[PDB]
Design an enzyme around this catalytic site. Structure first.
Site, short mmCIF file in Angstrom:
data_model
loop_
_atom_site.label_atom_id
_atom_site.label_comp_id
_atom_site.label_asym_id
_atom_site.label_seq_id
_atom_site.Cartn_x
_atom_site.Cartn_y
_atom_site.Cartn_z
CG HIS A 101 -2.03 -1.04 1.12
ND1 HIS A 101 -2.91 -1.28 2.15
CD2 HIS A 101 -2.36 -1.90 0.13
CE1 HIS A 101 -3.75 -2.24 1.80
NE2 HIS A 101 -3.43 -2.64 0.58
CB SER A 152 -2.10 -2.67 -7.60
OG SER A 152 -2.61 -3.25 -6.41
CE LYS A 189 -11.31 -8.27 -12.31
NZ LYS A 189 -11.01 -7.37 -13.47
CG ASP A 190 -10.68 -9.23 -4.89
OD1 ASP A 190 -10.28 -9.41 -6.06
OD2 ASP A 190 -10.08 -8.52 -4.06
CD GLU A 194 -0.14 -34.33 -2.67
OE1 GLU A 194 -0.68 -34.01 -3.75
OE2 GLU A 194 -0.59 -35.23 -1.93
#
Ligand SMILES: CCCCCCCCCCCCCCCCCC(=O)OC[C@H](COP(=O)([O-])OCC(O)COP(=O)([O-])OC[C@@H](COC(=O)CCCCCCCCCCCCCCCCC)OC(=O)CCCCCCCCCCCCCCCCC)OC(=O)CCCCCCCCCCCCCCCCC
Ligand SMILES: CCCCCCCCCCCCCCCCCC(=O)OC[C@H](COP(=O)([O-])OCC(O)COP(=O)([O-])OC[C@@H](COC(=O)CCCCCCCCCCCCCCCCC)OC(=O)CCCCCCCCCCCCCCCCC)OC(=O)CCCCCCCCCCCCCCCCC
Ligand SMILES: CCCCCCCCCCCCCCCCCC(=O)OC[C@H](COP(=O)(O)OCCN)OC(=O)CCCCCCCCCCCCC
Ligand SMILES: CCCCCCCCCCCCCC(=O)OC[C@H](COP(=O)([O-])OCC[N+](C)(C)C)OC(=O)CCCCCCCCCCCCC
Ligand code: HEM
Ligand code: HEM
Ligand SMILES: CO/C=C(/C(=O)OC)c1ccccc1Oc1cc(Oc2ccccc2C#N)ncn1
Ligand SMILES: CCCCCC(=O)OC[C@H](COP(=O)([O-])OCCN)OC(=O)CCCCC
Ligand SMILES: CCCCCC(=O)OC[C@H](COP(=O)([O-])OCCN)OC(=O)CCCCC
Lengths: 61, 75, 105, 378, 52, 267
Positions: free
Chosen positions: D200, D204, D226-227, D270
């Site tokens: 922050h 972004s 959107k998230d 895995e």
């Protein structure tokens, strides 16, 4: 022609946020039974004669 | 942090915006959407496809060479 | 001047159209990464070039949102790409190099 | 004036999830930030509810897990959520990291390097979680990996025997792995808050790599919804694995209890560790395998130092895009080789793919950025 | 403590009574639905799917 | 030719009103009207009659970003009913409660309007004004303010909070203040021959009559807190506004956030 159903749904239920919530919590109550009842009916139909509740009557006594 | 009103300097730029209750949320979804997806793939297919095809060739050969190596021969 | 230098220019125009920032209306100096030297050079631009840079970046970010591009008529032609920021950035670097040469003594 | 802005508690939430200026053009590859946050929370809830029934002792560790899937009410749904949630965690981590390489987000040094620490601690967490059910692969996966530490010169055995609490993977090793598997996800969550603190400070990045201060939008409602939509797709992917194929990503050997004497035929990790398992086995030397195995992930901390391009994002760099997908396909090759036996021709392919991995990151991709600068005449 | 005793403060209570009564119904119906409270649900027509 | 076409089309006797006010008998005005305005085509021009169709209102936003200007200007409004609607009286009472502010006012923190008090105490603006602009069957109802570039959000928040407060929880005393502000405004405005002459001319075109002051008092006295809550909700609550911005408006809220300020989740 009177106003559409979505128009009478808005002014009667969705305008106030309190009734908007009361609509949702009441819509959640009937949706759960109607969806669980219908959805289970699809699962059992696809698996007819295989689940225990279908062969249950043979071993009553 | 960073706040609105302290970000940067802009001049002479006008922006027109429509309310979301007066426009469609899916305007020409298939009419303009599908041509734009073909454009977006065609503009990047030559960047992404070759290395995964090169993997698919190595994957296929190495799996064939692996099985035929343990199978017996007349020797 | 010769046929071979037109082939180097030919691949540069190819890479330019392959880079694709001209499809969004941008210019080459709009795409540069902002370090301290670049930030100073942008700070020194005259008002008109600053306002033009701001709108092209704004228009390109608007296109990038919609995953769209401009019509081909409005793309940035390679021959018309103006290096408006390079003379300012060359001078900012030259000053820093002078400060860095005094710091050695 | 406004309670949301002035209250000491709400202003932190407000300046992080509500009024945060975010770019108008960040794509679906920016959704994996929140999805990682959801996976971490999802793994903690299911992880805790499994700890109410799991016991960290060899005589009952295997059967306590069985007790959950059979007797405990909805224990089976809680376990497979935990096992598959870990895989979804690593899907998101790899998209999250790949987004940072392609689009140049690594130029945020503090955010990126703390990300590398987040990748390592999440890997260490899942590695210790896989030991807890105490199946065949749980034991032998722990044996082959911890034995690598004996290759360190002059303190190898003393370090391995200290981590074991004995002379092999045993009772003392199983119990502490449970304790460490418990403590780490909270240490992870705290580091994920510092991960956001440094972010922050700058805001972004965006797909173009160009500054978006001229065009910002508030995080709410545009990226809250959107998230949420992206989180809904995450639950789709998770529940498809839980409710239709819960044993697809797992190994059948782990359904057999541990056996220090009998070794399974093919010891494979895995899927989210196969690429590094291949790099390990492709190096003949033992100490060289450990260094390459550790350098396979610590190399990410060198990417900011190996950035040559005048442009930030690969969006406008075709020659770097091709090398980027060469890194993905080469990693998809190491993944494939990792789940295969060490025999001809997989030995040679695994060595070529291993060299290609470090060659792409250290040599080729930096060189492409320089060529791209010359073609643009700067 | 006695600041809120006057004509205006009684008018404010009047204006928010229909709202506060609805949030109580949202909370009440939400509590009955969340817990499957059979004391109240057994009287509703369509949710009688209990088969005691 | 464009101008003469405009005159012959619109400057027609049935569409004009000769208004007067002051010391004069109505007879000599009507005589002078016959003496000079008789020579004007009237009551049947041709098959060229103008008629005002309705005008669509659109919830929308226009933002002219210009950071060279020292103060931002913002105008936000919803659709009003129009000239003839009886709801304009109650709307003007609600606007009078919110009122208006300027940095030269003396009251400051003790002002009755919560928006004006908070705007003066925290210095959220240089000025604001409510308005109810009336057109035929439509209008713009809202407010306009001007403020520093870091006060646009706070000012919008306090403004919308007062629309919502009046929509849901208006009280009787403040409504009486809005009625008293309107009574004083109406009588203070009709002081002089030119204001009254304007009220005569404009009213005959809009209302088709002069509404006496005693009738305005009757409609004002009918308003109470219930009328304001019902009338404000009819035009404000959960409605798409038209927003216009100009100046340093980086901090101007997004339209969705503005649209969310038109309802309360608590209500
Ligand atoms: C499920 C597995 C998904 C595998 C990855 C799919 C890649 C993708 O494009 O995701 C869509 C989606 C598009 O989001 P976006 O923000 O609009 O664009 C992202 C990039 O900028 C995309 O860059 P781009 O602008 O160059 O576009 C590349 C192109 C790529 O499109 C293709 O290559 C497939 C073309 C399909 C043609 C129809 C054949 C049937 O994608 C599109 O244009 C839209 C695709 C819409 C899906 C239609 C499928 C039918 O991106 C993602 O969700 C990425 C994460 C997906 C991983 C999920 C695994 C769990
Ligand atoms: C789960 C925990 C649930 C906590 C619920 C808290 C509700 C609350 O605090 O009431 C305040 C809230 C005040 O909102 P308002 O009446 O529209 O007035 C706006 C303010 O003047 C102030 O308006 P404003 O313009 O300053 O901000 C509008 C605000 C309006 O939303 C809120 O303030 C609600 C507080 C956030 C709750 C987050 C849910 C979790 O929107 C937000 O900022 C929240 C964005 C959520 C970000 C989540 C990121 C993921 O009233 C309610 O929502 C009560 C009804 C809630 C339904 C409960 C079901 C029974
Ligand atoms: C270390 C761990 C190893 C584990 C191995 C795991 C197996 C890998 C399986 C491969 C799955 C591939 C995912 C799907 C890829 C879709 C790419 C795409 O749609 O096209 C290219 C796209 C172009 O978009 P631009 O932003 O350049 O311009 C857009 C203008 N319309 O460009 C982009 O959108 C690219 C953004 C970055 C995506 C990241 C995916 C790669 C994940 C692994 C990276 C690990 C790095 C160490
Ligand atoms: C102990 C027992 C207690 C039980 C209580 C049960 C109560 C059930 C819910 C009822 C509350 C409703 C509140 C409401 O309705 O107000 C929320 C908001 C309004 O909606 P609106 O903006 O239309 O404004 C509305 C404008 N009007 C009112 C004029 C139309 O609703 C939205 O916006 C958000 C909706 C989106 C849903 C997804 C959020 C979940 C998180 C992610 C999930 C996936 C990954 C985890
Ligand atoms: C538990 C692990 C992690 C969590 C929960 C997490 C979460 C987040 C979130 C929420 C964001 C902001 C939204 C977004 O960009 O999607 C973000 C950004 C970022 N993260 Fe992570 N992260 C984690 C690990 C990592 C790792 C492993 C890396 C790389 C090695 C990394 C590098 C970055 C970078 C560079 C950004 C900025 C991206 C940009 O601004 O474009 N993070 N992270
Ligand atoms: C980043 C967070 C986490 C990750 C990636 C993770 C991963 C894993 C994985 C992959 C397993 C193997 C499961 C199996 O094969 O059946 C496991 C086991 C286990 N984990 Fe976690 N875990 C996390 C958080 C937690 C937390 C916070 C707890 C405790 C509060 C926990 C408790 C357990 C338990 C009790 C087991 C053994 C039960 C079982 O095998 O299903 N986990 N973990
Ligand atoms: C306890 O063993 C766990 C395993 C697993 O896959 O857990 C999810 C495992 C199983 C079989 C064989 C090995 C196993 O563990 C591992 C662990 C592992 O850890 C790393 C991952 C990335 C980079 C370096 C390392 C190391 N060391 N890399 C490869 N296999
Ligand atoms: C705050 C924690 C409350 C825990 C209650 C619980 O777990 O559920 C018990 C009952 C079940 O419904 P019933 O019709 O069997 O009723 C059987 C009665 N024992 O549900 C209720 O009746 C809900 C009561 C809520 C009161 C606060
Ligand atoms: C238990 C129920 C909690 C209800 C909280 C709530 O819904 O938050 C408000 C927003 C929508 O309201 P608004 O932002 O328009 O504000 C209106 C102002 N008048 O909704 C969302 O989109 C936020 C997402 C929340 C994720 C947890």
């Amino acid at each position: 022609v009177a106003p559409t159903l979505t128009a009478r749904l808005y002014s009667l239920l969705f305008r106030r946020t309190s009734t908007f919530a009361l609509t949702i919590v009441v819509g959640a109550l009937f949706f759960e039974r109607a969806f669980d009842q219908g959805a289970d009916a699809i699962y059992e139909h696809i698996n007819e004669g295989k689940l225990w509740k279908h062969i249950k009557h043979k071993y009553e006594n | 942090g960073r706040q609105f009103g302290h970000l940067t300097r802009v001049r002479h730029v006008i922006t027109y915006s429509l309310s979301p209750f007066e426009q469609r949320a899916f305007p020409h979804y298939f009419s303009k959407g599908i041509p734009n997806v073909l454009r977006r793939t065609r503009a990047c297919i030559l960047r992404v496809a070759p290395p995964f095809v090169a993997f698919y060739l190595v994957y296929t050969w190495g799996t064939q060479e692996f099985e035929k190596s343990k199978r017996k021969n007349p020797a | 001047v010769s046929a071979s230098s037109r082939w180097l220019e030919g691949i540069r125009k190819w890479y330019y159209n392959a880079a694709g920032f001209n499809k969004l209306g941008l210019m080459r100096d709009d795409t540069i990464h902002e370090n301290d030297d670049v930030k100073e050079a942008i700070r020194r631009l005259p008002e008109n070039l600053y306002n033009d840079r701001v709108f092209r970046i704004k228009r390109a970010l608007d296109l990038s949102m919609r995953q769209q591009i401009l019509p081909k008529e409005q793309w940035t032609k390679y021959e018309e790409d103006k290096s408006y920021l390079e003379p300012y950035l060359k001078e900012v670097i030259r000053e820093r190099k002078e400060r860095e040469e005094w710091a050695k003594k | 004036t406004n309670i949301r802005k002035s209250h000491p508690l709400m202003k932190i939430v407000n300046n992080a999830f509500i009024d945060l200026p975010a770019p108008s053009n960040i794509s679906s590859w920016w959704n994996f930030g929140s999805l990682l946050g959801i996976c971490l929370i999802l793994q903690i809830l299911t992880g805790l509810f499994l700890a109410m029934h799991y016991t960290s002792d060899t005589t009952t560790a295997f059967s306590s897990v069985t007790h959950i899937c059979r007797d405990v009410n909805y224990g089976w749904i809680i376990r497979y959520m935990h096992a598959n949630g870990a895989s979804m965690f690593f899907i998101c981590l790899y998209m999250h990291v790949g987004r940072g390489l392609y689009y140049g987000s690594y130029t945020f040094l503090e955010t990126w390097n703390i990300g590398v620490i987040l990748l390592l601690t999440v890997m260490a967490t899942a590695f210790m979680g896989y030991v807890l059910p105490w199946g065949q692969m749980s034991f032998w996966g722990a044996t082959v990996i911890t034995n690598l530490l004996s290759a360190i010169p002059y303190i190898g055995t003393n370090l391995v025997e200290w981590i074991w609490g004995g002379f092999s993977v045993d009772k003392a090793t199983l119990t502490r792995f449970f304790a460490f598997h418990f403590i780490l996800p909270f240490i992870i969550m705290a580091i994920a808050m510092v991960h956001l603190l440094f972010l922050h400070e700058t805001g972004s990045n965006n797909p173009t790599g160009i500054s978006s201060d001229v065009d910002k939008i508030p995080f709410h409602p545009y990226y809250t919804i959107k998230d949420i939509l992206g989180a809904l797709l995450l639950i789709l992917a998770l529940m498809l694995l839980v409710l239709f194929a819960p044993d697809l990503l797992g190994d059948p050997d782990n359904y057999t209890p541990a056996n220090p004497l009998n070794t399974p035929p093919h010891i494979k990790p895995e899927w989210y560790f196969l690429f590094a398992y291949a790099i390990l086995r492709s190096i003949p030397n033992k100490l060289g395998g450990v260094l390459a195995l550790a350098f396979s992930i610590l190399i990410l901390a060198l990417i900011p130092l190996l950035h040559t391009s005048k442009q930030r994002s690969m969006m406008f760099r075709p020659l770097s895009q091709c090398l980027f997908w060469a890194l993905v396909a080469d990693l998809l090759t190491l993944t494939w080789i990792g789940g295969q036996p060490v025999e001809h021709p997989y030995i040679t392919i695994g060595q070529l793919a291993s060299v290609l991995y470090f060659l792409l990151i250290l040599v080729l991709m930096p060189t492409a950025g320089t060529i791209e600068n010359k073609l643009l005449k700067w | 403590l006695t600041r809120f005793l006057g004509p205006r403060y009684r008018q404010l209570a009047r204006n928010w009574v229909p709202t506060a009564s609805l949030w109580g119904a949202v909370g009440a119906v939400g509590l009955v639905w969340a817990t499957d409270w059979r004391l109240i649900l057994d009287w509703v027509p369509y949710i009688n799917g209990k088969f005691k | 030719a464009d101008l003469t076409e405009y005159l012959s089309r619109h400057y027609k006797a049935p569409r004009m009103v000769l208004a007067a006010a002051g010391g004069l008998e109505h007879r000599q005005l009507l005589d002078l009207a016959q003496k000079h305005f008789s020579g004007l085509s009237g009551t049947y021009d041709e098959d060229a009659v103008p008629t005002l169709s309705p005008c669509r209102f659109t919830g929308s936003q226009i933002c002219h970003r210009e950071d060279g200007l020292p103060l931002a200007h913002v105008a936000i409004a919803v659709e009003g009913p129009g000239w003839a609607h009886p709801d304009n009286v109650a709307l003007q009472v609600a606007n009078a409660i919110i009122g208006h502010y300027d940095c030269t006012y003396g009251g400051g923190a003790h002002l009755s309007s919560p928006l004006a008090s908070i705007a003066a105490t925290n210095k959220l603006c240089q000025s604001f004004q409510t308005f109810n602009i009336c057109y035929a069957d439509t209008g713009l109802l809202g407010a306009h303010f001007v403020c520093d570039h870091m006060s646009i959000d706070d000012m919008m928040f306090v403004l919308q909070g007062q629309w919502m407060r009046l929509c849901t929880s208006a009280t009787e005393s403040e409504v009486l203040r809005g009625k008293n502000l309107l009574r004083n405004a109406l009588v203070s405005h009709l002081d002089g021959t030119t204001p009254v002459c304007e009220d005569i001319g404009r009213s005959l075109l809009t209302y088709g009559r002069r509404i006496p002051l005693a009738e305005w008092e009757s409609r004002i006295a009918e308003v109470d807190a219930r009328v304001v809550r019902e009338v404000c909700s009819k035009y404000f609550y959960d409605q798409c506004p038209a927003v216009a911005g100009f100046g340093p408006i980086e901090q101007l809220p997004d339209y969705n956030r503005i649209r969310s300020g038109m309802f309360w989740l608590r209500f």
